[PDB]
Amino acid sequence: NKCGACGRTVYHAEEVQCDGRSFHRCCFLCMVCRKNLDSTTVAIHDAEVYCKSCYGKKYG
Pick the closer one to Zn ion by CB: 33 or 44.
33
Pick the closer one to Zn ion by CB: 16 or 27.
27
Residues that bind Zn ion (CB under 5 A): 3, 5-6, 24, 27, 30, 32-33, 35, 51, 54
Shortest Å, Cβ 60 to Zn ion: 15
* Contacts of range 23-31, beta carbons closer than 8 Å, 24 or more positions apart: 23/49, 27/3, 29/4, 29/5, 30/54, 31/4
Shortest Å, Cβ 32 to Zn ion: 5
